[PDB]
Structure 1
Amino acid sequence: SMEQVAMELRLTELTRLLRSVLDQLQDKDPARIFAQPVSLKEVPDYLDHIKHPMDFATMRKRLEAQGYKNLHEFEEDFDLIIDNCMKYNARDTVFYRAAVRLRDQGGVVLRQARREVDSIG
């Protein structure tokens, strides 16, 4: 049907917006602390601490498979990146502080994205 292809046109254009947003988020992480999953070889206890790991490459795989149905789902994954790091790493660490900074700077990007998703539809 044609309406399935308009919705697919909706999902497709959400994906185009979300890719730009992801690239802008991933620019606020020049250290690449959040680029890949935490290594279970290097942190073998990680899953005892963090139940739902996330990272930018994992978000990107999902985006490219048109796996984000709305902005809420995408924000949930970006919030896992931040939140997992602030739980696993102590307040006085380079990791924790990188997450705070990503959260702060990301908020600006996400605030305008929410306006574009509502505005464009």
Structure 2
Amino acid sequence: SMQEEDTFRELRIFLRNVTHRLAIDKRFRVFTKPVDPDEVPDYVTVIKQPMDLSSVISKIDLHKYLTVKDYLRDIDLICSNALEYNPDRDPGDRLIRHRACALRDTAYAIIKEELDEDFEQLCEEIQESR
């Protein structure tokens, strides 16, 4: 229905806003674009499902997220990829993992404060009906 389409549009608007707020945070710069294979040639062989905040915006605009849960799976993937690709005690690895964790915790904290649970439940019930 039109009302359901309005619901998913409202979802996309919310997701774009959250994603922008993550993308402008200096700590999360490393997560804002896909890894450049020229810079990091073994990346795509170790990490099977790359994800970044630019790709997240593209996916919002492609209507790939019909729930906040779906979105958070991609935020989680950004974080888990960083953890897997940079697992060493070295400070470069530790910094990125700390930032990856902060990206994830920040997204979740925003959503906890700003997403109405009934709005999410509505999205989920529309998605389930399709």
Query: What interval of TM-score do these two structures reach, taking the shorter chain for normalisation?
Result: 0.7 to 0.9
CA shift for structure 1 position 53:
0.3
Ranked by relative contact order (alpha carbons within 8 Å, sequence separation 6 or more), the top structure is 1
AA matched with 2:45? D
The count of corresponding residues between Structure 1 and Structure 2 is 117
Identity of aligned residues (%): 30
What's the TM-score once normalised by structure 1's chain length? 0.82
| Map of 1:86 onto structure 2 | 83
| Map of 2:127 onto structure 1 | none
Q: Could you list the structure 1 runs, at least 4 aligned residues long, displaced by more than 3 angstroms after superposition.
A: 27-31
| Map of 1:118 onto structure 2 | 118
What's the TM-score once normalised by structure 2's chain length? 0.77
What secondary structure is seen at the aligned counterpart in 1 of 2:116?
helix
| Map of 2:56 onto structure 1 | 59
| Map of 1:50 onto structure 2 | 47
Q: Which runs of 5+ in 2 are unaligned?
A: 123-130
1:32 equivalent among 23, 29, 32: 29
RMSD after superposition: 2.0
- For residues 54 and 31 of structure 1, the distance between their equivalents in structure 2, rounded to whole angstroms, comes to 13
After superposition, give the CA deviation of every residue in 1:59-80 in whole Å (9 maximum; x if it has no partner): 0011122221111110001111
